[PDB]
Design an enzyme around this catalytic site. Sequence first.
Site, PDB file in Angstrom:
ATOM      1  N   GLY A 230       0.809  -1.297   0.079  1.00 10.13           N
ATOM      2  CA  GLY A 230      -0.021  -0.075   0.005  1.00 10.13           C
ATOM      3  C   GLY A 230       0.950   1.229   0.027  1.00 10.13           C
ATOM      4  O   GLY A 230       2.109   1.242   0.001  1.00 10.13           O
TER       5      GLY A 230
ATOM      6  N   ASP B 134      17.065  -8.955   3.792  1.00 10.85           N
ATOM      7  CA  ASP B 134      16.843  -8.002   2.649  1.00 10.85           C
ATOM      8  C   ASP B 134      17.584  -6.488   2.808  1.00 10.85           C
ATOM      9  O   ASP B 134      16.951  -5.402   2.666  1.00 10.85           O
ATOM     10  CB  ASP B 134      15.395  -7.898   2.086  1.00 10.85           C
ATOM     11  CG  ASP B 134      15.045  -7.316   0.798  1.00 10.85           C
ATOM     12  OD1 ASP B 134      16.056  -7.483  -0.043  1.00 10.85           O
ATOM     13  OD2 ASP B 134      14.156  -6.519   0.574  1.00 10.85           O
TER      14      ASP B 134
END
Length: 338
Positions: A27, A139
């Site tokens: 989002g 990550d």
Amino acid sequence: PEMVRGQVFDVGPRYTNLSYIGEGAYGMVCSAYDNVNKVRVAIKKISPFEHQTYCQRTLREIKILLRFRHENIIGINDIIRAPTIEQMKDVYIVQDLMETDLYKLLKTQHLSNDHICYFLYQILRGLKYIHSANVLHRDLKPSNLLLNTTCDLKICDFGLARVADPDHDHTGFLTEYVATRWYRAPEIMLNSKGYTKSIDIWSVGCILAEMLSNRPIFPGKHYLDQLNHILGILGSPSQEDLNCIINLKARNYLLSLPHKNKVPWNRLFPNADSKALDLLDKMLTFNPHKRIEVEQALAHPYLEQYYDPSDEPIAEAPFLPKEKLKELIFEETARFQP
Ligand SMILES: CC(=O)NCc1ccc2[nH]ncc2c1
């Protein structure tokens, strides 16, 4: 109900005067004035509830970030959602507003050696805490390192994080992987699931190299091209390091390649501090068992002006279908409700 870029951004009366920042995984991202603490804050909208993977990652991050407390790790200040499961379509996560991130800074700013040293120290100090909780970030990359106007750094984005599991790290050759390609350790492409702490150190090494030149060190354009970028600079693995790869598909691939010599770090990075390049070399070691660990990296001569293990805290302890995961996101966010 406030609208941004033609979508509901439903953050209640507490948070007002929204300005669009950017576009997250699940989002939109906005700043907002927090009428209680009287500061602007960042808020990201998360809509994960149709997909089990977006649910998994949303829940992982929430659980990790609520449990962690560290100056170099982004906190969750608030979570906004509907009062009932049935009415909850979205979740808003409120975090400290940070002026920039390392990706934006690298595209636009030359970093002094003093800035590189301080950024690296903060990354490793945060990573010491994460690893001390037996968690892998998996990550780490410039866009996940947030910075404020005084260059305080916070690690964010724990959606791909896992508990370390070194006994289940082995896999075959060319096994698909999710984390960002340019920051993937060479073993990912050869024989590793990315379940050991050494995966994160490789990414930090890539980040350090990118701070030195403003350019990613190993910008592979596809899965196997990432390995061949790495080998182009490190050169061919030694016999000993090759012998650690027992898998024959992986071993024979490496043996099939023409001999490549190492590119000396001081030719790649002629303006870099020599101690920074000694540490870079140790983080970008091909063999993950010989790669430097986070606490050793902090103790490296490059970071001597900052190193203070009494002020580099550790965690107090170690750390399914979409319907059960919606319930679990609901339960985990309950502490922020009236
Ligand atoms: C990687 C990510 O999630 N970026 C969005 C984000 C998160 C927290 C933030 N604080 N300030 C700015 C800002 C941006």
